[PDB]
């Protein structure tokens, strides 16, 4: 009777039963296939490797991500990832359990049909739903009013919610995300002669960004000091014993989120879209949203991001308005934790799209029960 | 139903049925022909002598090796050696039994056709295969990951294998081998006035190198000590009672493998090619290869070679990486023992090149089933 | 008052005054040192040989290239090459003349300081600049809009230029070049038993590739025909009278640029990076770049490369878009000819980095006047 | 002696001498500035581009419109546009000629002073006037009684005129216009996965709306049919050969003008404000206005708009009253053509605001000679 | 200040001051001692006879050569020969003059110490050197590149020199020489019944070989003709009037150098070692050595040897390579003439091994200053 809260994270798939408080599995969404012929006969080899397998065989595999900007580009890759998720990681047969998926808002409608038909006719789920990720993030705080800024592996979006009403004219989609910051980090490391090229090495640079990067409060003073304050510089080890030394490159990376023109992006910075979504609201409610500005998603984990956000938005919003950036701990899981709560809420049983209803309407039925 | 594991060693032919644990015959690959006319009539003489015959008649024969650098230079000599191997040493008719041969990698393709056509139309074998020697060496340890350094009578090569995948872009062929060390030992012995010239005497110098030579750990301190430490010097007897005295010449011979410029060779030493083959690998797997660095071939039998290898490669590879030179005993037979195992492995029955398949494709078929 | 257009080619150094139309000197960038002791006393020997000297003494020298992938690895070798270039080949004192250098984009910044400090304090140049090679190539056609594909001895890169604006977010660096094709040609020649090993012999294989190789338009039909059409095969002489015969090896070499997986490279082929650099551009300008697709660098000299390029990119770009591969003659010098023009253009006198400006800023000044 | 009929269109500036019958120049009101540094030296570049220049360089420019909702937001941008208009497009010196401007009614009075002072002291015009756009539209029909519905790029308004008297208590200003319809078209195209983001791409979507959109007479039956009648769907080409397919999106765009709640606008539809302006009139004259309901402005060019207007207003106005929507051809220029006539009418010479009169009154004088 | 160019010829000692152009003394290296008791009292007899004395008393002496294969076997005999050379033939005291000796390469090192200690402590020379004979031969032609084939009384060797660098990995030592040809001539003369046995008679057969032997160009046709062409046969007188008649024995002697299997030698003929030394060289330089193939030593004086050499090596070396056997006149002295030049060359004064340096290092010092 418990729901399977699944997910379609662009980076990490997340899964675990409702009523639990932490996800049971987290693993990268990678499909990999061998690049060279097997020559030691009888390995018990496989045609393809997924999850942890592909982070270990990482020297001999072509790696693909089947998700780009939240749009699934290859359904035969994407179908294998789920076929692994149910049968091997959770080890639970899906035809007993209602399955709750998620996606970003403002997606090409054809994706919502494909996921529905795969669930109803490969896996034969009893029922399905398709929630909108930012809405689930808000239940983690137990609030009912706030602007959500959510920034995953592959997209950033804003959704203002007031009194449990969404304002669908105000949503912003901003295609700037951790995958872009990683691809930019490869170019500034090349200034020091370290060279990375392959998909096997992208997965090594990403381990730097999770450990040594932090956000400066006054980037101009910081970068002027970094010319002399050698105490900034830090050292890290590759898999082989090759040492790496890192300097002002520690913070020129996450500075991209506040000045996307560094990666040549035309779209405004994350605070300028956070502000400009409030300006779409009726001139009453603005006072309430400045008190409930909630952040989620892993690309807000960098130490000091909340302190920067407050100082930036204080320059835009008028004075006498107080601003309260609510950036709680564990915000790397809120989108999943909120999923666990909602799937347990007694009233939601009205919304399960039945198998019988799809056979009469055809796939388009899921356009009737969303924004 | 058992396979004949044959071989094409440059020095010693090795043969014996699969499922046995030691080769039944080992003898030098020499064809010899008389240099002078028979004058005591009625000896029951022969036109040519092969194997043990030629190591005994060694005063009256012209000796030839039909193998140079793993490339067979004379097919009519080479065909006699096998004609001896089956009918007289194993005393088994070959037209019952699948025959497994070996060769070094990176060979002129014409050799692989000649061996195939001789097997199919002189001996009329039922089936054939052509394995790559270094790959077979790895089964002797029962490993599935490692760098193999194999150095026979006539060639040295490296092959890194990861997860049962070979990396054909990384293979090194190095034409420095025991035959060169023997031809160099003849020149430094001449410093003491002992004189050897003929092919009958090359086979006597080789008996020195197998008995009195050893590898110094600190060649500069060793050679500086050898000027005074008379306890280094050793004595040995020729076939006649002529005594020989040997001194710093005990170790200046195997020092050649680490400094080929002594024989004027331009190519780097065996550890520098062992290292530089790892540097062709993707920056993930290096950590695994430093733990599985396996040696085989008779020119690694010298006492103390493994201890030298470790100290040399520790200077090249970064610290904090542990290095484990796995130089097991009996490594003079691993290439054959691994052959016995592989020919018994149940899955290999898919690979036997049938007689029927050669008559349709022609000799080129064997280019389709190798690197 | 005329500029010295120097260069840092990975293969051939090129030099000659501005306002001339062809370079006065071209010679390989090799430093060589003797491998054996001089024994005929009184030769008038030298410690080291550079340029033409080392292509003649080619049997007794260790040869090094001081340039790898456009990154200078040894400054004491590299300083000798220039010390030869000014004083012996041009026979002109450099302290009169402004000196214009070049380098590939996306290089470790430390190299740009070293070259600057050597010019200001060994040679005492009056002024210096550091242009970006692909930008100079475009002046040879007198165009102001186009995508440049430039592929020298040691690196390949793409730079789209529109209306005289570079788009620094779109540049591709691809480390696949003639030096890799030569090292691959040594392995497929070994199939026929010809053996080359030493740096003296690499400089002989390279003479084959410049003379007998050509690009097939339909590699699958060509290779299927080459099994029977003996009229493909060609013969060539080594320095000694040893004849060589070459067959399908004529074209399997330059096929590498379109399928780098043959040398096991993961990066896409030169047309796939040429295409994928256009896809970084704003959806307006693509129509203009398909009309101005200019090639330069010696590794585009092979007969028939332009005809292959057009047929390949026509499969990627949509129809109704016309494609015009502009592959003019003399494209082996465009990067130098464009240098001669730019150094004569009246407005460039604003950009000469003065000696006085370096003494105040220190070496970092050259980071202020580039991409 | 002829007047310069200039204009302040929100989208297209329009200019041409009085007594001509068609405007001599029409070009977008855009100022653009380069986004990246010039790197091909000596282009003859400019700091800023205006008019046709900016529709061609459209891949490298930041574009701004200096007009929003008829309120000029930046006077230094706006002053350049006119500086281009006189000296380069008309190529006529303005200090000879009386200049007639226009603006929407109900504007912040400060704008009317700024335009006046710029004309008197930068350009030194001999005289000026400031007509109200909807009043000029009526002379194109040669009528003297009618309700005008005028809907330009940036504002919509209604003005009833009876017997040449305006009724200033009845004017409606409605801030819904083509710029809003374009920004809404970007969101429904994203349903099909086509993505546009930048100001360079807004100017491409606008080319769709001028070509494929039309107004349905019975939107509910049309949209119900569009689920099956594939003959609705149409195809169009981007600048690159990318084909686009469009379906019910052809007509859901201009449906916004009749149901602004689709874009979440609270204000009533254009017919409901057209009706509710008549209800402000004295209960005599209504019969006359239903016979002279004249439309102008480009956002009434869509095929079939007049037929929809008649059926809508027939539901509001009582029966037995006949309704006659007068939607003539060329209504894209009436506001300019009527300007040409009025500036030639002999009696208007009483109204030219003299230079002498401004120096005595100060800028406020223009509040004395309007509504 | 002039050097004493001495020598250690196996057959003829050669001596004469530097700066002279011909040796002042040449005499056989023989020590002889009486075989019978003196019985005519008061002859003024001597215990031993050396040089010309022993060629005259040749009927009553035991003769010994103290040199065998270039290795001195008896130092008390060898010390007398020099004691004669200085005090009686040159009549010059050696303690004034630097003394230059020679030896063959590849000799037992103990010989180089013995000669050094005898020179420093019996004769008390001021300085010494030990040159390598084949290197001195090359100065006679004034060349700096060539392969030297040198074949004295007691050894044959090859040394390729390129650009004044020797290639110590390529040297061949071949122990086939005039002393062997003389001992073979004694056996074929015995076919005609002439009998020689004693050391007194060996010195008579040697006078035949210097006068009647010549090399056939086509030995098979020559020997077939010699069965009938009596005009071949020649006659010669012994010391007594005994006439000797010689026929095909004129040329079957020097034919041994091209087919050593006639004397049962296993080693290849002098042209096969001359060729096979070139094949040790890097594949560049071979073209240069075929143009500078210089011969020296008395066993190349036979009429027609050069014409045979060219026809033989033309069969081995590929065509299109030209071959130029440089066999100049006076080649019986080149090894001495080149000694006279080198000892006069101004730079050689750096190499004289001082007396002071030997007393510190001990005898081993001379291993430091040679190959
Ligand atoms: N400790 C960390 N510090 C900073 N960033 C992190 C850290 N751990 C993970 N990340 C970033 O989190 C991203 C994944 O965000 P996530 O919210 O999981 O996206 P999704 O849920 O859509 O997979 C990774 O791409 C990585 O860049
Ligand atoms: N006891 C020993 N110590 C050192 N070297 C040995 C010993 N026995 C044999 N060898 C060397 O082993 C070489 C043969 O190596 P091997 O692996 O048999 O080559 P292959 O297998 O190709 O014939 C011989 O040439 C000899 O130099
Ligand atoms: N005739 C030719 N045909 C094909 N390739 C050539 C020819 N001549 C030279 N090359 C190639 O040109 C390369 C040098 O390219 P180049 O543009 O000179 O590089 P760089 O300018 O950086 O030295 C050489 O490595 C060689 O492989
Ligand atoms: N052929 C067409 N069909 C429909 N709309 C059009 C067409 N041509 C132009 N438009 C619209 O006309 C608008 C401009 O209206 P216009 O009356 O020129 O405003 P202004 O005069 O204030 O610039 C443009 O924004 C565009 O949306
Ligand atoms: N006229 C000649 N023709 C052929 N051979 C000669 C002649 N004169 C001398 N010889 C040979 O020259 C040999 C001596 O060679 P030589 O170069 O003097 O040796 P070395 O210099 O070491 O004494 C003698 O043994 C003799 O056989
Ligand atoms: Mg996420
Ligand atoms: Mg072996
Ligand atoms: Mg170049
Ligand atoms: Mg208008
Ligand atoms: Mg001699």
Author numbering:
A (entry chain B), B (entry chain D), C (entry chain C), D (entry chain A), E (entry chain E): 5 to 375
Copy text verbatim from the article accompanying this structure deposition.
To decipher the structural basis of this mechanism, we performed a single-particle cryo-EM analysis of ADP-ribosylated F-actin. We obtained a 3D reconstruction of the ADP-ribosylated actin filament at an average resolution of 3.5 Å, which allowed us to build an atomic model for F-actin including the ADP-ribose. Therefore, it is unlikely that the ADP-ribose modification itself is sufficient to stabilize actin-actin interactions to an extent that would lead to a toxic effect. However, when we compared our model of ADP-ribosylated F-actin with available structures of F-actin in complex with actin-binding proteins, we found that the ADP-ribose moiety occupies the same position on F-actin as the major actin-depolymerizing factor cofilin. Steric hindrance of the cofilin-F-actin interaction by the ADP-ribose could provide an alternative explanation for the increase in bulk amount of actin filaments in toxin-injected cells. This confirmed that the modification impairs the formation of the cofilin-F-actin complex. Thus, unlike R177-modifying enzymes, ADP-ribosylation of T148 stabilizes actin filaments indirectly by hindering cofilin-mediated depolymerization.
One of these enzymes is the actin ADP-ribosyltransferase TccC3, whose activity leads to the clustering of the cellular cytoskeleton and ultimately cell death. Here, we show that TccC3 HVR modifies only actin filaments (F-actin) and not monomeric actin (G-actin) as previously proposed.
